[PDB]
Amino acid sequence: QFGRDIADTTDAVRDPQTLEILDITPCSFGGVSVITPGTNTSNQVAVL
Amino acid sequence: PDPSKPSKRSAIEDLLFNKVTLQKF
Numbered sequence: 649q650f651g652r653d654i655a656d657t658t659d660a661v662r663d664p665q666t667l668e669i670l671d672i673t674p675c676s677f678g679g680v681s682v683i684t685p686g687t688n689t690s691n692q693v694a695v696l
Numbered sequence: 697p698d699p700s701k702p703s704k705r706s707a708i709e710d711l712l713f714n715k716v717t718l719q720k721f
């Protein structure tokens with residue numbers, strides 16, 4: 649019924665009704681950083 | 697080096713690279 653990765657984490661699951669298997673990919677995430685020169689030069693910023 | 701490395705003679709770089717070669721939740 650389940651699939652697991654080497655890290656013992658759930659990877660794939662089988663549909664109980666139509667017995668098909670679906671991959672489980674987690675939703676995206678990540679850090680946010682702010683780019684800026686000195687405040688004494690401008691107040692513009694760019695984010696990554 | 698060789699720009700596209702098209703020569704039959706492989707640089708030591710490729711050998712070392714291949715020798716070293718050989719989550720979102």
Ligand SMILES: *[C@@H]1O[C@H](CO)[C@@H](O)[C@H](O)[C@H]1NC(C)=O
Pocket residue numbers: 687688
């Ligand atoms: C910015 O410049 C002003 C004067 O031009 C000065 O008083 C202030 O200390 C400066 N601050 C920084 C962080 O450079």
